[PDB]
Design a protein around this ligand. Structure first.
Ligand SMILES: *[C@@H]1O[C@H](CO[C@@H]2O[C@@H](C)[C@@H](O)[C@@H](O)[C@@H]2O)[C@@H](O[C@@H]2O[C@H](CO)[C@@H](O[C@@H]3O[C@H](CO)[C@@H](O)[C@H](O)[C@@H]3O)[C@H](O)[C@H]2NC(C)=O)[C@H](O)[C@H]1NC(C)=O
Ligand SMILES: [Cl-]
Ligand SMILES: [Zn+2]
Length: 586
């Protein structure tokens, strides 16, 4: 009966709020204070939520969902029939949760040490090395050391994790875990769609890749860069070569049009991690969107503690499922890169606040890509030279083609370069999940995709025992990654649409939507839907059409593509890496 399904949904929602809230705090306390005590409590609360999940998951499966007239109820019940890990027998559930905590703890406490003295952590020490050093050998020491410590130490857990996560998924009706993760998008054509989208950005990526390779050749020398081969993975200013903006100094198109040192500028003017979130909070309120509650400031962890405390440093945002308590945990460093991250995270918080009146089951993004896109959309405006100048972090750069092409390169090194990395991660994991990649081939298959999609090679040949994917946070933390790919495509579709709505004319990359209430309304109406409707409804609301599309991104960067083509031709570059077998001779 319809009414029995309505009662169940009401019961599931009341008890989920309480249970999910207690979990959230336990998980929070461990994430911000890694100890044995908090570790134990989190594992105990894991069993409690699993017990709530099992109970309602079992009730949910006694209902025939496609014989139910109300769609919103049909949609809630369907979700609740997926128990995720709670489908496992008791022994396996216990092993799975322990393994996840073991992998996460291992990642977060790993250090890379000189035998003489100092021991470095990932954030901020090794990060800062990858961002600032221009010495091949020092970059190499950090890149390899990180992988020797975090990557190799995760390898012992992974096959068993894969086994249990797949068991869970099969018991919830999926064929494996990758299958289950793709289902979150409710888009049967997903793989084809993502591939089409990846192919559309190849012109821009291969041209970017060749130009950066050239500038690397210039700086690190011809004996260490093959201009027809892949780039060594440790020279791009980032530990995973996922964003390249930190080597802007090596690739600046017009050196005669220099930019202010934004890090120097923020420090000299007394910017704190707290001021960086206040400024993002102001952007959101300028659009007519909600302010973060007072509680957010009292309880969030906006910097790395100076306290001895071991914490999980990866930037993230938290919903406690009472509709009032939302938090960010970030090891914020005072620089431009983390100003963008602050906006990204504050986007999560705004999404939480926007859908807080929905049933808890529908309290997530239209799809996971939408959740990651909101902050980034505002950050695109914040990032414009015009806006940064109004924050006094750049001097005037307007009305000069040289600064304009420089800005677009700066943006391209983060936005375009992340397209292939973000695509690659779950191509590898999906194939791990479906058994196409065994633990004999974890690493080799990782590097085949690194080569194929990104055009990177490892600077040091990989040995038996390496598990480089373990050195990226999301692998051991078991966080799906394709969302960031979707995110980078659609945030530009959102930018374009919001700019149109705000009355901006002229090139898209000059748009700044600060204070546009018309832009605000669109985001707000879409965010309010939560997971209540299929994601094309939200896309439609924001952009006036229902597809994912690379058009907005190609239009944003079109002036850069013309400039890269002319430049690369002028120097006779081969686009791609035809000599794909090349690795550093050294
Ligand atoms: C299918 O059912 C959904 C879900 O609504 C509800 O869930 C059930 C389990 C029961 O608890 C119901 O009592 C409960 O309504 C219906 O969605 C709901 O529709 C109503 C009617 O418009 C919405 O009411 C609005 O509430 C806001 C307050 O924020 C007011 O400002 C509006 O003026 C209006 O009163 C309600 O918000 C909405 N909720 C959700 C989650 O969708 C839906 O109408 C129904 N569909 C059909 C075809 O019957
Ligand atoms: Cl790697
Ligand atoms: Zn995010």
């Amino acid at each position: 009966d319809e009414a029995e399904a309505s009662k169940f949904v009401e019961e599931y929602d009341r008890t989920s709020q309480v249970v999910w809230n207690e979990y959230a705090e336990a998980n929070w306390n461990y994430n911000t204070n890694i100890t044995t005590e908090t570790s134990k409590i989190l594992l105990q609360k894991n069993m409690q939520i699993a017990n709530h999940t099992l109970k309602y998951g079992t009730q949910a499966r006694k209902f025939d969902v496609n014989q139910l007239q109300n769609t919103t109820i049909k949609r809630i019940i369907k979700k609740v029939q997926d128990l995720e890990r709670a489908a496992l027998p008791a022994q396996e559930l216990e092993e799975y949760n322990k393994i996840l905590l073991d992998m996460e703890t291992t990642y977060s406490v790993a250090t890379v040490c000189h035998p003489n003295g100092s021991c470095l952590q990932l954030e901020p020490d090794l990060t800062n090395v990858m961002a600032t050093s221009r010495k091949y050998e020092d970059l190499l020491w950090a890149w390899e050391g990180w992988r020797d410590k975090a990557g190799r130490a995760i390898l012992q857990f992974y096959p068993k994790y894969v086994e249990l996560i797949n068991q869970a998924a099969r018991l919830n009706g999926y064929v494996d875990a990758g299958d289950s993760w793709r289902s979150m998008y409710e888009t049967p054509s997903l793989e084809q769609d993502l591939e089409r989208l990846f192919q559309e950005l190849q012109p821009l990526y291969l041209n970017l890749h060749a130009y950066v390779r050239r500038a690397l050749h210039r700086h690190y020398g011809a004996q260490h860069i093959n201009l027809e081969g892949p780039i060594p993975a440790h020279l791009l200013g980032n530990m995973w070569a996922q964003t390249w903006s930190n080597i802007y100094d090596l690739v600046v198109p017009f050196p005669s049009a220099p930019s202010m040192d934004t890090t120097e500028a923020m420090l000299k003017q007394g910017w704190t991690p707290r001021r960086m979130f206040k400024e993002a909070d102001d952007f959101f309120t300028s659009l007519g969107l909600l302010p973060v509650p007072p509680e957010f400031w009292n309880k969030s962890m906006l910097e790395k503690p100076t306290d001895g405390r071991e914490v999980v440093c990866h930037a993230s945002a938290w919903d406690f499922y009472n509709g009032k308590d939302f938090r960010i945990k970030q090891c914020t460093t005072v620089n431009l890169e983390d100003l963008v991250v602050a906006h990204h995270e504050m986007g999560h918080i705004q999404y939480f606040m926007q859908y807080k009146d929905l049933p808890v089951a529908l309290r997530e993004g239209a799809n996971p890509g939408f959740h990651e896109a909101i902050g980034d959309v505002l950050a695109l405006s914040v990032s414009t030279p015009k806006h940064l100048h109004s924050l006094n972090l750049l001097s005037s750069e307007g009305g000069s083609d040289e600064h304009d092409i420089n800005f677009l390169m700066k943006m391209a090194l983060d936005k375009i370069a992340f397209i292939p990395f973000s695509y690659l991660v779950d191509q590898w994991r999906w194939r791990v999940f479906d058994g196409s990649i065994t633990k004999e081939n974890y690493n080799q298959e990782w590097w085949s995709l690194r080569l194929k999609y990104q055009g990177l090679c490892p600077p040091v040949p990989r040995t038996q025992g390496d598990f480089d994917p373990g050195a990226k946070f999301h692998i051991p933390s078991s966080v799906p990654y394709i969302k960031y790919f979707v995110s980078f495509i659609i945030q530009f579709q959102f930018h374009e649409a919001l700019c149109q709505a705000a009355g901006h004319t002229g090139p898209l990359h000059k748009c700044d939507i600060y204070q546009s209430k018309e832009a605000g309304q669109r985001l707000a109406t879409a965010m309010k839907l939560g997971f209540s409707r299929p994601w094309p409804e939200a896309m439609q609301l924001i952009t006036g059409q229902p597809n994912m599309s690379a058009s907005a991104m190609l239009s944003y960067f079109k002036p850069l593509l013309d400039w890269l083509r002319t430049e690369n031709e002028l120097h006779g570059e081969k686009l791609g890496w035809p000599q794909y077998n090349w690795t550093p001779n050294s």
